[PDB]
Coordinates of all heavy atoms in Angstrom, one line a residue:
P133 N -9.2 2.7 4.8 CA -7.9 2.1 4.4 C -8.0 1.2 3.2 O -9.0 0.5 3.0 CB -7.5 1.3 5.7 CG -8.9 1.0 6.3 CD -9.7 2.3 6.1
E134 N -6.9 1.1 2.4 CA -6.8 0.2 1.3 C -5.8 -0.9 1.7 O -4.6 -0.6 2.0 CB -6.4 0.9 0.1 CG -6.0 0.1 -1.1 CD -7.2 -0.8 -1.5 OE1 -8.2 -0.3 -1.8 OE2 -6.9 -2.0 -1.6
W135 N -6.3 -2.1 1.7 CA -5.4 -3.2 2.2 C -4.9 -4.1 1.1 O -4.2 -5.1 1.4 CB -6.2 -4.1 3.2 CG -6.5 -3.3 4.5 CD1 -7.8 -3.0 5.0 CD2 -5.6 -2.8 5.5 NE1 -7.7 -2.3 6.1 CE2 -6.3 -2.2 6.5 CE3 -4.2 -2.9 5.5 CZ2 -5.7 -1.6 7.6 CZ3 -3.6 -2.3 6.6 CH2 -4.4 -1.7 7.6
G136 N -5.1 -3.8 -0.1 CA -4.6 -4.5 -1.2 C -3.3 -3.8 -1.7 O -3.0 -2.7 -1.1
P137 N -2.7 -4.3 -2.8 CA -1.4 -3.7 -3.2 C -1.4 -2.2 -3.6 O -0.4 -1.5 -3.3 CB -1.1 -4.6 -4.4 CG -2.3 -5.3 -4.8 CD -3.1 -5.4 -3.5
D138 N -2.6 -1.7 -4.0 CA -2.7 -0.3 -4.4 C -2.5 0.6 -3.2 O -2.4 1.8 -3.4 CB -4.1 -0.1 -5.1 CG -4.1 1.2 -5.9 OD1 -3.0 1.5 -6.6 OD2 -5.1 1.9 -5.9
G139 N -2.5 0.0 -2.0 CA -2.2 0.8 -0.8 C -0.9 1.4 -0.8 O -0.6 2.4 -0.2
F140 N 0.0 0.8 -1.7 CA 1.4 1.3 -1.7 C 1.6 2.2 -2.9 O 2.7 2.6 -3.2 CB 2.4 0.1 -1.7 CG 2.2 -0.7 -0.5 CD1 1.4 -1.9 -0.6 CD2 2.6 -0.4 0.7 CE1 1.2 -2.7 0.5 CE2 2.4 -1.1 1.9 CZ 1.7 -2.3 1.7
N141 N 0.5 2.5 -3.6 CA 0.4 3.6 -4.6 C 0.4 5.0 -3.9 O -0.5 5.2 -3.0 CB -0.9 3.4 -5.4 CG -1.0 4.4 -6.6 OD1 -0.3 5.4 -6.7 ND2 -1.9 4.0 -7.5
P142 N 1.4 5.8 -4.2 CA 1.5 7.1 -3.5 C 0.3 8.0 -3.8 O 0.0 9.0 -3.0 CB 2.7 7.8 -4.1 CG 3.0 7.0 -5.3 CD 2.5 5.6 -5.1
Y143 N -0.5 7.8 -4.9 CA -1.6 8.6 -5.2 C -2.9 8.1 -4.6 O -4.0 8.7 -4.8 CB -1.7 8.8 -6.7 CG -0.5 9.5 -7.3 CD1 0.6 8.8 -7.9 CD2 -0.4 10.9 -7.2 CE1 1.7 9.5 -8.4 CE2 0.8 11.6 -7.7 CZ 1.8 10.9 -8.3 OH 2.9 11.5 -8.8
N144 N -2.8 7.0 -3.9 CA -4.0 6.4 -3.2 C -4.0 6.8 -1.7 O -3.2 6.3 -0.9 CB -4.0 4.9 -3.4 CG -5.3 4.3 -3.0 OD1 -6.0 4.8 -2.1 ND2 -5.6 3.1 -3.6
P145 N -4.9 7.6 -1.3 CA -5.0 8.1 0.1 C -5.3 6.9 1.1 O -4.9 6.9 2.3 CB -6.2 9.1 0.1 CG -6.9 8.9 -1.3 CD -5.9 8.3 -2.2
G146 N -6.1 6.0 0.6 CA -6.4 4.8 1.3 C -5.2 4.1 1.9 O -5.2 3.5 2.9
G147 N -4.1 4.3 1.1 CA -2.8 3.8 1.5 C -2.3 4.5 2.7 O -1.6 3.9 3.5
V148 N -2.5 5.8 2.7 CA -2.0 6.6 3.9 C -2.7 6.2 5.1 O -2.1 6.0 6.2 CB -2.2 8.1 3.6 CG1 -1.8 8.9 4.8 CG2 -1.5 8.6 2.4
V149 N -4.0 5.9 5.0 CA -4.8 5.4 6.1 C -4.3 4.1 6.6 O -3.9 3.9 7.8 CB -6.3 5.3 5.8 CG1 -7.1 4.9 7.0 CG2 -6.9 6.6 5.2
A150 N -4.3 3.1 5.7 CA -3.8 1.7 6.0 C -2.4 1.8 6.6 O -2.1 1.1 7.6 CB -3.8 0.9 4.7
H151 N -1.6 2.7 6.1 CA -0.2 2.8 6.6 C -0.3 3.2 8.1 O 0.4 2.6 8.9 CB 0.6 3.9 5.9 CG 1.8 4.3 6.7 ND1 3.0 3.6 6.6 CD2 2.0 5.3 7.6 CE1 3.9 4.1 7.4 NE2 3.4 5.2 8.0
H152 N -1.0 4.3 8.4 CA -1.0 4.7 9.8 C -1.6 3.6 10.7 O -1.1 3.4 11.9 CB -1.6 6.0 10.0 CG -0.7 7.1 9.5 ND1 -0.7 7.6 8.2 CD2 0.3 7.8 10.1 CE1 0.2 8.6 8.1 NE2 0.9 8.7 9.2
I153 N -2.6 2.9 10.3 CA -3.1 1.8 11.1 C -2.1 0.7 11.3 O -1.8 0.3 12.5 CB -4.4 1.2 10.4 CG1 -5.5 2.3 10.5 CG2 -4.9 0.0 11.2 CD1 -6.7 1.9 9.7
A154 N -1.5 0.2 10.2 CA -0.6 -1.0 10.3 C 0.8 -0.7 10.9 O 1.2 -1.4 11.8 CB -0.4 -1.5 8.9
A155 N 1.4 0.4 10.5 CA 2.6 0.9 11.1 C 2.4 1.3 12.6 O 3.3 1.2 13.4 CB 3.2 2.1 10.3
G156 N 1.1 1.8 12.9 CA 0.8 2.0 14.3 C 0.8 0.8 15.1 O 1.5 0.7 16.1
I157 N 0.1 -0.2 14.7 CA 0.1 -1.5 15.4 C 1.5 -2.1 15.5 O 1.9 -2.5 16.6 CB -0.8 -2.5 14.7 CG1 -2.2 -2.1 14.8 CG2 -0.5 -3.9 15.2 CD1 -3.2 -2.9 13.9
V158 N 2.3 -2.0 14.5 CA 3.7 -2.5 14.5 C 4.5 -1.7 15.5 O 5.3 -2.2 16.3 CB 4.3 -2.4 13.1 CG1 5.8 -2.6 13.2 CG2 3.8 -3.6 12.2
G159 N 4.3 -0.4 15.5 CA 4.9 0.5 16.4 C 4.6 0.1 17.9 O 5.5 0.2 18.8
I160 N 3.4 -0.3 18.1 CA 3.0 -0.7 19.4 C 3.7 -2.0 19.9 O 4.2 -2.1 21.0 CB 1.4 -0.9 19.5 CG1 0.8 0.5 19.4 CG2 1.0 -1.6 20.8 CD1 -0.7 0.5 19.0
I161 N 3.6 -3.0 19.0 CA 4.2 -4.3 19.3 C 5.7 -4.2 19.5 O 6.3 -4.6 20.6 CB 4.0 -5.3 18.1 CG1 2.5 -5.6 18.1 CG2 4.7 -6.6 18.4 CD1 2.0 -6.5 16.9
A162 N 6.4 -3.5 18.6 CA 7.8 -3.3 18.7 C 8.2 -2.4 19.9 O 9.2 -2.6 20.6 CB 8.4 -2.6 17.5
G163 N 7.3 -1.5 20.3 CA 7.5 -0.7 21.5 C 7.5 -1.6 22.7 O 8.4 -1.5 23.5

């Protein structure tokens, strides 16, 4: 996962990883 701003770069896969981790956790809390 990429946890710096480049994580929101669409061409950075590290961003896809970081996304699923963070949005996952958020999904859990909100759930």
Side-chain angles (χ1 to χ4, degrees):
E134 170 60 54
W135 292 115
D138 199 37
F140 305 98
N141 188 343
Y143 295 98
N144 191 334
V148 178
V149 183
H151 167 81
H152 283 91
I153 293 172
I157 291 172
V158 166
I160 290 163
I161 294 173

